[PDB]
RNA sequence: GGGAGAAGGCACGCUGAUAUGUAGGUGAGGCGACUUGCUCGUGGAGCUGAAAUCAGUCGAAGAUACCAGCUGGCUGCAACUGUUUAUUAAAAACACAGCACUGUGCAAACACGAAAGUGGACGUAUACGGUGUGACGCCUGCCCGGUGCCGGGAGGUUAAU
RNA sequence: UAGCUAGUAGGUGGGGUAACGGCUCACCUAGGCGACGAUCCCUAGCUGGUCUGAGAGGAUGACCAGCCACACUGGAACUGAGACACGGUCCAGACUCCUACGGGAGGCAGCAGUGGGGAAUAUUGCACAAUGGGCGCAAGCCUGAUGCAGCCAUGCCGCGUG
RNA sequence: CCCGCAGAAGAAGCACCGGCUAACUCCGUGCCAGCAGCCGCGGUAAUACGGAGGGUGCAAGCGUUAAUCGGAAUUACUGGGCGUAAAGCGCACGCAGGCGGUUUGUUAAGUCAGAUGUGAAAUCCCCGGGCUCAACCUGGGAACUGCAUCUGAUACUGGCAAGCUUGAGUCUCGUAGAGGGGGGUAGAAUUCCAGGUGUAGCGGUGAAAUGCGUAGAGAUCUGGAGGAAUACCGGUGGCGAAGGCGGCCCCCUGGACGAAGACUGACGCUCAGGUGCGAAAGCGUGGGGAGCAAACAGGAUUAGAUACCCUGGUAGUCCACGCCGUAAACGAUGUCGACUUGGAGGUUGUGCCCUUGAGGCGUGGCUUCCGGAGCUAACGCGUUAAGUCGACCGCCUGGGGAGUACGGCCGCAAGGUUAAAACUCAAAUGAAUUGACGGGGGCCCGCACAAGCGGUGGAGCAUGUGGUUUAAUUCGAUGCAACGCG
RNA sequence: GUUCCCGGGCCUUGUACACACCGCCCGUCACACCAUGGGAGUGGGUUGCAAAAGAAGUAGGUAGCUUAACCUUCGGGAGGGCGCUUACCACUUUGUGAUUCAUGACUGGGGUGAAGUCGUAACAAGGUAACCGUAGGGGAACCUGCGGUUGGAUCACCUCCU
RNA sequence: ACUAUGUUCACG
């Protein structure tokens, strides 16, 4: 307030980081992948939900959520990486394409394939 | 200290109508005369007088209609800290032309409706709805 | 304050020129004058003379000889200059400024001395002696059972007489 | 990032520039910039615009058009009306290159295309028929400029699928 | 582009269906497997998971991801705030800067009006036109919010000359005050020191003990030494910018307020950097040291007690000279000015009548409390605003990370000051509301306690449970409210 | 007989409780993961200063070697070209800083994680009111001193007064 | 006088 402090210091606009740091508005990102897991979330949940760390292709080193029920992920294996919070296990922030490279689509699935990645029956 | 007189004229016209009081002594001047006259010549206030000779002393006479009073709203425009002229097309219109602007014009001091049909605009001093 | 000559660089000879030797130092024959002078203040003839810049020039090399720092980084110990085993040890040892405890009221404590007397000191507790520690910065914790020291005086034991 | 700055800031005179100018010299003066942000650091081609928004603004600058900049990296000039010259020249460098070992090449940020990078983005096509461009009286020759074609639901829009 | 056959022939997916958000059932699974944009779904009757049917929404596309704006008035110029939610620097002085009472001039910088040039074309926009339609192309128009110059206008703002008196300041005269700095001295008390009296305790505590005492303490009296603090007066009293400031007396000294004049003539208000002051605790050096008292020791308490309680007790607390630069430095409320109903006090002035008897009306300063409009999320504030406006400054932008790190600046140090990011969460927060609770308060009541009386718990047996055993020892009840219970 | 123990009732008050005190909740310690500072250092990127360097080219100077037009006394003048040379200067070299990004034994805190350990610091007078500053202490919340704030509770137990 | 604690998610 007062418009001659405005003159003096002007309105700083808030930059608001981004969520997941893919860096350069990447859609996807490849990632080599190591040590695939298992981890439980945080309270109301309870579960064994699947995760692997991912060796990203520019350099950073994050960990992806696995959707579906079952993968062929182990050890190496090169995946696919898009954005997206899991908001349960704290730290992952990141989910693997099922579908795209060495991630194969879920086995027996008919409704919402293109999630999951699929074809049809 | 005393920066802004012609706002703190207009605080005593606001903080009399609220008060529900007949009449607002203040230090009169050249300024004050025309803009207390514009008020009084549309309607807003009822007569005023400018009795003094060595420390002259501007008294207003307000007007009520109803219990309720005229001045529903007043509040000024170009303060001293921002001044703000506008050009002839920019004009504002105060509660869409039922309201004026009082606007110090090069042809004296003017209502916002008189500065439209003259040809040119100024620095307006004050929004009276 | 330093470190620091940190590190590391570049320029250096000779010959002309600027300048028939310069700024500078330097002061004479003069001339005011002021008086009686080993005079004041001009005055600047000669001698003296860097340091530069510019242009040449020779050599492989120009601070050419003698003379005349090796430098930097990490780290223990001791703050420092100093002292020490004359004649195998120079140091981390001693000392040191600074710090604490302690004694000492002046015929001072203490020391040398059978003593007189001397130093301490022709000083007087902001002084003096002893002990430890050892600039400076941050600090210096618990134990008084044992050994010492200090204070207390009832009681026990206790010499000479 | 609080001080930077010695051709630095101005003068006189000489040279040089198509043109004026510390453009560049010699001397002279001691400035100049700086809290209305110099200097230093990081980032960035700029605009018409684009997207968004009630508007103010916010974000952005692919395609079309104007300006700048650059041409393997670092320099220099020559030629010319115009360049300190994408497919000129000369050195130097790194990397590919062929040789008879003496020495030579070479420059896709023109068009296709390859490897590599990447989440990801295309044919080693046809044609000067038009529209400009180049030279030439012209005819014409030249032209990956342009006009077509390929590819891709990448979009916008139409008709399907009775 | 036009006809010519041919035959529905070759030509439909994929999201979603718990709320936000258009659309529901059934099986499978059982906090597993999984979903998730936000809230959240799954623990054996899932609308949210997986499948199935059914629906809904888009359809040669659909969804997911990333990216920008929007909604976000969540950086607020239009258009937010800062008593308690995030947010007034601890408080002053003050240069640059922002703002400035009032009347004449006078320019024309700002401002306003007009005019001319330009703001490339495309794009956008509107009326047309052309491709079967559309996208697309395209004619004209408007626009290009601008910038420049040129001529005017003088209200306002600025510059510039005089003013002028309301602001602001000076002088005269008094009044009040723990304002300050330096120096004296007074009495009460506490402690220790010396002595007299005197005979077992004193001291302390919830209860004890450590501690002091037959060496004669405690108590009592006399004389003395110290140091520190000033009973009562003393108040919702006063003074100070804030921090803060209390015995009494002098020395120097700053300000405040009132009275009626005279003078100056806007000299003013704010203030980034900057400087000054700044409780307590610390720190340095030199003193001082009664009481008190971190640390420390012992004794209790306790499961433990590095605490609370007790007995001791050193730095410190005190003075001189420097440093520190912080506090819930608080009215949690920046400074200055104007304006807007009241009431009850306190405090300090000053005028007019009769002091005609501790009177009475007035008008000023400072101040405590309760309330009106108005404001506020509410609580509350309310002429000393958090009301109504103006000037300027400081600050805020979800909670954690963090007033932390790094770097600077300052500091003897302690540390102060300036001040991030990654990461992480969907909250954190304020006021008020209904309950419930409290080793909060009041008032009652009940075999609740007291006042009694007889029992259980000891024994043996009956019965019921637990357990253990068993082929089975069916099943249920399992704090009061299951256990001679169904 | 009503002070206390237990339960209940009404009123009032504080509350960080609402599974509503059998509530909530703080910090160490233990384990896992993530990001993050310090750290003997190590490995780059960029870049300041101080020099050395000097290829090509351009310009200035020219003892040397030349040489078509101009002038000519038919001798040669002029002028040019090479070579040499000086300046300017690129590569490259040396030293030393600055800054920035990686990385590093170990280490300091920080965050997160359904049912670990130790206590119970806070919220009620939270059982010693809480908190702020500061100093000392302590396994941990914390405790203690000094000053400050109310964002503390009860102020029918005293007893005696207006 | 002193006098500690109440595993996790849920049901409203
Ligand atoms: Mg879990
Ligand atoms: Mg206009
Ligand atoms: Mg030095
Ligand atoms: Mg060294
Ligand atoms: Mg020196
Ligand atoms: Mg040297
Ligand atoms: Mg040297
Ligand atoms: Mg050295
Ligand atoms: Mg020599
Ligand atoms: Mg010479
Ligand atoms: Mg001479
Ligand atoms: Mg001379
Ligand atoms: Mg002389
Ligand atoms: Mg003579
Ligand atoms: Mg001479
Ligand atoms: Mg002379
Ligand atoms: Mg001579
Ligand atoms: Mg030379
Ligand atoms: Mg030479
Ligand atoms: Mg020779
Ligand atoms: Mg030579
Ligand atoms: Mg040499
Ligand atoms: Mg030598
Ligand atoms: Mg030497
Ligand atoms: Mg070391
Ligand atoms: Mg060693
Ligand atoms: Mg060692
Ligand atoms: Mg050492
Ligand atoms: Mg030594
Ligand atoms: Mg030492
Ligand atoms: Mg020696
Ligand atoms: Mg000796
Ligand atoms: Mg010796
Ligand atoms: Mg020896
Ligand atoms: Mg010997
Ligand atoms: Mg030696
Ligand atoms: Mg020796
Ligand atoms: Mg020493
Ligand atoms: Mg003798
Ligand atoms: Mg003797
Ligand atoms: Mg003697
Ligand atoms: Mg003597
Ligand atoms: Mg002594
Ligand atoms: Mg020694
Ligand atoms: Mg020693
Ligand atoms: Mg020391
Ligand atoms: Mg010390
Ligand atoms: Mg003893
Ligand atoms: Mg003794
Ligand atoms: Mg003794
Ligand atoms: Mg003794
Ligand atoms: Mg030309
Ligand atoms: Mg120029
Ligand atoms: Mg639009
Ligand atoms: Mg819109
Ligand atoms: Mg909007
Ligand atoms: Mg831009
Ligand atoms: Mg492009
Ligand atoms: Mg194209
Ligand atoms: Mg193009
Ligand atoms: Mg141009
Ligand atoms: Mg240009
Ligand atoms: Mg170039
Ligand atoms: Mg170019
Ligand atoms: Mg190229
Ligand atoms: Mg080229
Ligand atoms: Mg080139
Ligand atoms: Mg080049
Ligand atoms: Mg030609
Ligand atoms: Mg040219
Ligand atoms: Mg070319
Ligand atoms: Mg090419
Ligand atoms: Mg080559
Ligand atoms: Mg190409
Ligand atoms: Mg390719
Ligand atoms: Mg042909
Ligand atoms: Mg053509
Ligand atoms: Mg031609
Ligand atoms: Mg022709
Ligand atoms: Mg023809
Ligand atoms: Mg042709
Ligand atoms: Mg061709
Ligand atoms: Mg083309
Ligand atoms: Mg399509
Ligand atoms: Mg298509
Ligand atoms: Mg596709
Ligand atoms: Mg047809
Ligand atoms: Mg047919
Ligand atoms: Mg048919
Ligand atoms: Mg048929
Ligand atoms: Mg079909
Ligand atoms: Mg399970
Ligand atoms: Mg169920
Ligand atoms: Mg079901
Ligand atoms: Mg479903
Ligand atoms: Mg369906
Ligand atoms: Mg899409
Ligand atoms: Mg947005
Ligand atoms: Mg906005
Ligand atoms: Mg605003
Ligand atoms: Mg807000
Ligand atoms: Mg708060
Ligand atoms: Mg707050
Ligand atoms: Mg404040
Ligand atoms: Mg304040
Ligand atoms: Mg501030
Ligand atoms: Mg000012
Ligand atoms: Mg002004
Ligand atoms: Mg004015
Ligand atoms: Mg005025
Ligand atoms: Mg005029
Ligand atoms: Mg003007
Ligand atoms: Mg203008
Ligand atoms: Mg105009
Ligand atoms: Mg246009
Ligand atoms: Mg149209
Ligand atoms: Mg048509
Ligand atoms: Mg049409
Ligand atoms: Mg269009
Ligand atoms: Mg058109
Ligand atoms: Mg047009
Ligand atoms: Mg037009
Ligand atoms: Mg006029
Ligand atoms: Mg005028
Ligand atoms: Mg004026
Ligand atoms: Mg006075
Ligand atoms: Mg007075
Ligand atoms: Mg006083
Ligand atoms: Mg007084
Ligand atoms: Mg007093
Ligand atoms: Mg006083
Ligand atoms: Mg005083
Ligand atoms: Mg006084
Ligand atoms: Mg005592
Ligand atoms: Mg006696
Ligand atoms: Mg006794
Ligand atoms: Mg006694
Ligand atoms: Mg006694
Ligand atoms: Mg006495
Ligand atoms: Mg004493
Ligand atoms: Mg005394
Ligand atoms: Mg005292
Ligand atoms: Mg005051
Ligand atoms: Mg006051
Ligand atoms: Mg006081
Ligand atoms: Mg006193
Ligand atoms: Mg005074
Ligand atoms: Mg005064
Ligand atoms: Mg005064
Ligand atoms: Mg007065
Ligand atoms: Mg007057
Ligand atoms: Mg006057
Ligand atoms: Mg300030
Ligand atoms: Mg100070
Ligand atoms: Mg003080
Ligand atoms: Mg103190
Ligand atoms: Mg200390
Ligand atoms: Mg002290
Ligand atoms: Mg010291
Ligand atoms: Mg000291
Ligand atoms: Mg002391
Ligand atoms: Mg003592
Ligand atoms: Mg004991
Ligand atoms: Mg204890
Ligand atoms: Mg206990
Ligand atoms: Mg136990
Ligand atoms: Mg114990
Ligand atoms: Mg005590
Ligand atoms: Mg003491
Ligand atoms: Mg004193
Ligand atoms: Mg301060
Ligand atoms: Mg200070
Ligand atoms: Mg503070
Ligand atoms: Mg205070
Ligand atoms: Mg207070
Ligand atoms: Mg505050
Ligand atoms: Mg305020
Ligand atoms: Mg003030
Ligand atoms: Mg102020
Ligand atoms: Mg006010
Ligand atoms: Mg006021
Ligand atoms: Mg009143
Ligand atoms: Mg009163
Ligand atoms: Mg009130
Ligand atoms: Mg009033
Ligand atoms: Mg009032
Ligand atoms: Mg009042
Ligand atoms: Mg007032
Ligand atoms: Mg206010
Ligand atoms: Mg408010
Ligand atoms: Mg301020
Ligand atoms: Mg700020
Ligand atoms: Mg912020
Ligand atoms: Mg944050
Ligand atoms: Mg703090
Ligand atoms: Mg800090
Ligand atoms: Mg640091
Ligand atoms: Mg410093
Ligand atoms: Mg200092
Ligand atoms: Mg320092
Ligand atoms: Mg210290
Ligand atoms: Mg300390
Ligand atoms: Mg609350
Ligand atoms: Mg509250
Ligand atoms: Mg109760
Ligand atoms: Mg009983
Ligand atoms: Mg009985
Ligand atoms: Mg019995
Ligand atoms: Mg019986
Ligand atoms: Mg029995
Ligand atoms: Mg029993
Ligand atoms: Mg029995
Ligand atoms: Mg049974
Ligand atoms: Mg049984
Ligand atoms: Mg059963
Ligand atoms: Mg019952
Ligand atoms: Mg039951
Ligand atoms: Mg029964
Ligand atoms: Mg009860
Ligand atoms: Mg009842
Ligand atoms: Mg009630
Ligand atoms: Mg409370
Ligand atoms: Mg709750
Ligand atoms: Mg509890
Ligand atoms: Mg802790
Ligand atoms: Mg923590
Ligand atoms: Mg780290
Ligand atoms: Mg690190
Ligand atoms: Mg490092
Ligand atoms: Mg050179
Ligand atoms: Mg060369
Ligand atoms: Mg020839
Ligand atoms: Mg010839
Ligand atoms: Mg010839
Ligand atoms: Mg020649
Ligand atoms: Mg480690
Ligand atoms: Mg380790
Ligand atoms: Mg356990
Ligand atoms: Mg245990
Ligand atoms: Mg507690
Ligand atoms: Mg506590
Ligand atoms: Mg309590
Ligand atoms: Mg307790
Ligand atoms: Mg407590
Ligand atoms: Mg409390
Ligand atoms: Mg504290
Ligand atoms: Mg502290
Ligand atoms: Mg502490
Ligand atoms: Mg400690
Ligand atoms: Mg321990
Ligand atoms: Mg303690
Ligand atoms: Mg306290
Ligand atoms: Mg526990």
Same mark, same amino acid.
């Given at each position: ?15 608001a ?30 579960a $064994?939900?699947?995760?692997? /760390? #991912?060796?990203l292709?520019? +350099? ?6 696995? *959707? ?11 995946? $696919?990486?898009?954005?997206? /919070? #899991?908001?349960?296990?704290? +730290? ?6 099922? *579908? ?15 999630k999951?990645? #699929?074809?049809?029956? | ?44 206030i ?48 105060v ?14 001091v ?20």
């Amino acid at each position: 307030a007062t418009v001659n402090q405005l003159v003096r210091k002007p309105r700083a606009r808030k930059v608001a980081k981004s969520n997941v740091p893919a860096l350069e508005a990447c859609p996807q990102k490849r990632g080599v992948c190591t040590r695939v897991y298992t981890t439980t979330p945080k309270k109301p949940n309870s579960a $064994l939900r699947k995760v692997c /760390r #991912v060796r990203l292709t520019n +350099g950073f080193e994050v960990t992806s959520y696995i *959707g579906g029920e079952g993968h062929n992920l182990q050890e190496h294996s090169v995946i $696919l990486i898009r954005g997206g /919070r #899991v908001k349960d296990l704290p +730290g992952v922030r990141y989910h693997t394409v099922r *579908g795209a490279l060495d991630c194969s689509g879920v086995k027996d699935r008919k409704q919402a394939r293109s999630k999951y990645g #699929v074809k049809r029956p | 200290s005393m920066q802004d007189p012609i706002a703190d004229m207009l605080t005593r016209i606001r903080n009399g109508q609220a008060a529900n009081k007949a009449a607002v002594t203040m230090p009169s001047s050249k300024l004050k005369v025309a803009i207390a006259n514009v008020l009084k010549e549309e309607g807003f206030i009822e007569d005023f007088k400018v009795e003094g000779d060595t420390k002259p002393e501007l008294e207003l006479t307000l007007k009520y209609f109803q219990g309720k009073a005229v001045v529903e709203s007043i509040q000024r425009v170009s303060r001293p800290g921002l001044r703000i002229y506008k050009r002839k097309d920019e004009l504002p219109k105060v509660m869409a032309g039922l309201g004026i602007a009082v606007v110090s014009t090069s042809k004296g001091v003017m209502t916002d409706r008189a500065a439209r049909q003259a040809g040119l605009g100024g620095e307006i001093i004050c929004y009276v709805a």
